[PDB]
Amino acid sequence: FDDAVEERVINEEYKIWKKNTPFLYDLVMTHALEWPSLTAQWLPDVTRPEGKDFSIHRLVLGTHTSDEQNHLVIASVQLPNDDAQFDASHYDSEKGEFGGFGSVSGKIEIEIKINHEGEVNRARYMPQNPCIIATKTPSSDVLVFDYTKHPSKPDPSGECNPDLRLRGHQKEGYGLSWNPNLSGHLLSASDDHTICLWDISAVPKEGKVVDAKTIFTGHTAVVEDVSWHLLHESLFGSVADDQKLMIWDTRSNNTSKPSHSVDAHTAEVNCLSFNPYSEFILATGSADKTVALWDLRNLKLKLHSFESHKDEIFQVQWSPHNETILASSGTDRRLNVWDLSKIGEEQSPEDAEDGPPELLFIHGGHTAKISDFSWNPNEPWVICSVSEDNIMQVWQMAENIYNDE
Amino acid sequence: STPDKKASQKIGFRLRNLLKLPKAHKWCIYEWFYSNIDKPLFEGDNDFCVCLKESFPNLKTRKLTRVEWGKIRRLMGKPRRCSSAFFEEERSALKQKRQKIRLLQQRKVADVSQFKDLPDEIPLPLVIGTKVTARLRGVHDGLFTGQIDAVDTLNATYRVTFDRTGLGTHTIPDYEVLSNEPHETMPIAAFG
Amino acid sequence: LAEGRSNTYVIKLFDRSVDLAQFSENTPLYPICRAWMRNSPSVRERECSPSSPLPP
């Protein structure tokens, strides 16, 4: 009934954002993919051609295809240096690569496509070797890939050739993260209410299927996401539909009872992310449209609260360059960027309508649910966001917002 | 076939796979489809260029390094945080602007016209019997080509008949129709 | 519609026309979508010429 008016308001909002973009962004690229991605992750490696104003970064992409062949995609996005020579008047609607900003040699070009059974729910690379990449399948099992052992162009035989195939679930899920400190430790979260733990650093080269090392049954509702601590190799947290944030410790002989348990939100909780500089802070996003900050030294008091998301939240990512910045996204078409240091500041009386004093920036660049996004770990404050409308945006907010000269 | 034809076959199949996605099609609509009444509001020389050049008429080029875009931005102010309140404000402003426009094609007068868009070349009202491009929504969703048959000036809609058989005659607002034949611009002095 | 050498390849999809001979296998989908919105005309003379006589 209202599908006409909702489409109409989305159209007007996007056109307005396209009109008044140049004030808000130092750089945007709007690139249309072949199939929607439920994942995105900047690869840590960066290469800079000599005498050329653009670097060559790299992103890991999955496809959400109806029935036929899916892929694991590793695209290379060329970003400009600080000596870049480009335009900022509008986007372009004119050049055949993207929605205008940044170097003329800003052009996402696919490099590796790999057979993948079903859609790619989530693909996270393993920090100790960006060659190895894990994937999340809609089926029970969780796959692991190495793209060095695969042809750049997939063979049309359609054989899924994972380096390992990891089992231990009963349904699908979305939570999946490696331990950044200890090589081969992979956590996955699924609908079966269980956190299964794998280790691949100690598997035979002859065994192509690997059982889970351990299974955690703490959650009672559907588990949504799980993440390791970024300084402690043995500590990880998880969130679920049960509105419960639980903190787990590997050393515990009790794998069925968590070390901590917190009723973080009054609704579904979809995401969590540890602060990569303060080992004591973490945040979560939830279906109650609020992003709940937390302090690990006391889990009875919620450190702070963020609002102004109009719909659910499906992702939250701390900045890799500044400890005070994080971003979130959800079913609402907007990606918000928060600033911890601005908490408690007294803004002008009206601007409370735009949002709380710490709401640093809102991204109006996606016409559909933003599936996932990730900060670039090499070039500060450049974010690649994908959405259900077959769009892969990489953008960098305007410089003057984050700098008070 | 041929290696070129097979390759171009692969491009065609890529595009077909892309367009079988309703959300991707909707995005294709939002990105490039502008009604004749929307084009003057955005696609002309936008307000960024006007304010930039009025603040620095001594600035030579409109394209240069991001480091000097930092200066050209700071020396304009801090852009407002674009939010739901900002979007509803701007949507109300767009309603006012396009109310102004429709007032202009009844051959009448309009706002004081301090806007940086549409100095005089207001898009003309549609003629009866021309081919226009519009978005048809419903049991047959998507963008289609059709012929115009009538005008509804009171509510600013149009009656169209499509060149696709089996679709028939439907009413589509003024701000969802595009005229294929070359764009017509006439000064506001003619509009009143 | 009019199947294609490589002089011109046109496929009719959703009542629109696009000239695929311009695009190699490496091209992204964004220009293809833009062209398919264009209702590809007869000739592709020049791409909105980069030359600008715009003064300071």
Numbering used by the authors:
A (entry chain A): 8 to 412
B (entry chain C): 95 to 286
C (entry chain B): 84 to 87, 91 to 142
Kindly provide excerpts from the paper associated with this entry.
Cell cycle-dependent transcription of cell cycle genes is controlled by the MuvB family of transcriptional regulators. The MuvB core complex consists of a main scaffolding subunit called LIN9, the histone-binding protein RbBP4, the DNA-binding protein LIN54, and the smaller subunits LIN37 and LIN526. Complexes of MuvB with the transcription factors B-MYB and FOXM1 activate mitotic genes during cell proliferation.
The excellent quality of the cryo-EM map allowed the ab initio building of an atomic model of a ~70 kDa structure accounting for the WD40 domain-containing RbBP4, the Domain in Rb-related Pathway (DIRP), and tudor domain of LIN9, the middle domain (MD) and a proline-rich loop (PRL) of LIN37. We name this portion of MuvB as RbBP4 subcomplex. In our structure, LIN9 amino-terminal region, including the DIRP and the tudor domain interact extensively with RbBP4 in four different sites around the conserved RbBP4 amino-terminal helix α1, which is a hub of protein-protein interaction in several other RbBP4-containing complexes. The basic loop following helix 5 occupies the histone H4 binding site of RbBP4, by being sandwiched between RbBP4 α1 and the PP loop coming from blade 6. Consistently, a reconstituted MuvB complex is not able to bind H4 peptides. Strikingly, a C-terminal PRL connects LIN37 to LIN9 α4 thereby buttressing LIN9 into RbBP4. Our structure suggests that LIN37 has a key role in stabilising the MuvB complex and, consistently, MuvB reconstituted without LIN37 can still form but it is less stable as shown by mass photometry. In conclusion, RbBP4 subcomplex is formed at RbBP4 blade 1, and 6 where LIN9 DIRP and tudor bind, and this assembly is stabilised by LIN37 middle domain and PRL.
